[PDB]
Design a protein around this ligand. Structure first.
Ligand code: CA
Length: 230
């Protein structure tokens, strides 16, 4: 039977509008009066980080802090503004203020607690994952929190999923993983025998729906799927 439900963090529990608002505010404080459009800086930042996240997929862990600092250091020299030494601190403060849970997150996490093991599996650094959970107020709704820093590898490396299963004491066959990246999340969890659920809220990933066991537009559907399986 399904005895554990694991969730991805960024893009699965926090709202896209809140993330965009937060990140724009980040670049606004990094720039200040500098004659650079903060929206343009953000777009270029997201460009470079998307390439970096792709290059490290499934590979040994490197601190995300270093990866993101590296990107911002390149951007500061390209455009001529002063590198923000407190970029990590600015990013946390803006995410804490403007970050936002999807409306159903607490309901779903509440409904699953007690009945199942509720865990998180994220590529973020451990201190970053805890700040994410603390800022949004959902830290105590998880029985386990597993990060790439602990496992030593980024998704979809099987080690990060294996560690989360070990923490829960359940077999991959007894676990579900919910995420929004078809290859990193659904593909990775499948290698451990886990049941994969893709979260496609805006229906933008039809091309990848064959890679996943289930596709949902709302986390409240996860409850139906687990019951349907047991
Ligand atoms: Ca994600």
């Amino acid at each position: 039977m399904i005895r554990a439900v694991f969730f991805d963090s960024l893009g699965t529990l926090n709202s896209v509008e809140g993330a965009a608002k937060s990140h724009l505010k980040i670049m606004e404080e990094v720039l200040g009066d500098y004659p650079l459009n903060p929206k343009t800086l953000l777009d270029e930042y997201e460009k470079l980080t998307r390439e970096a996240f792709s290059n490290y997929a499934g590979k040994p862990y490197r601190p995300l802090r270093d990866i993101l600092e590296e990107v911002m250091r390149k951007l500061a020299e390209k455009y001529g503004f002063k590198y923000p030494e407190n970029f990590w601190e600015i990013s946390l403060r803006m995410s804490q203020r403007y970050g936002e849970l999807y409306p159903e997150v607490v309901e779903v996490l509440k409904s699953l607690k007690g009945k199942y093991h509720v865990g998180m599996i994220t590529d973020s650094d451990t201190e970053q994952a805890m700040a994410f959970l603390d800022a949004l107020g959902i830290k105590d709704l998880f029985d386990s929190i597993t990060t790439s820093e602990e496992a030593g590898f980024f998704k979809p490396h099987p080690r990060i999923f294996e560690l989360a299963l070990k923490k829960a004491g359940v077999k991959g066959e007894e676990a579900v993983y919910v995420g929004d990246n078809p290859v990193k999340d659904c593909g990775g969890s499948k290698n451990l025998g886990m049941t994969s659920i893709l979260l496609d809220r805006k229906g933008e990933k039809r091309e990848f729906w064959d890679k996943c066991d289930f596709i949902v537009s709302d986390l409240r559907e996860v409850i139906k799927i687990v019951d349907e399986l047991n």
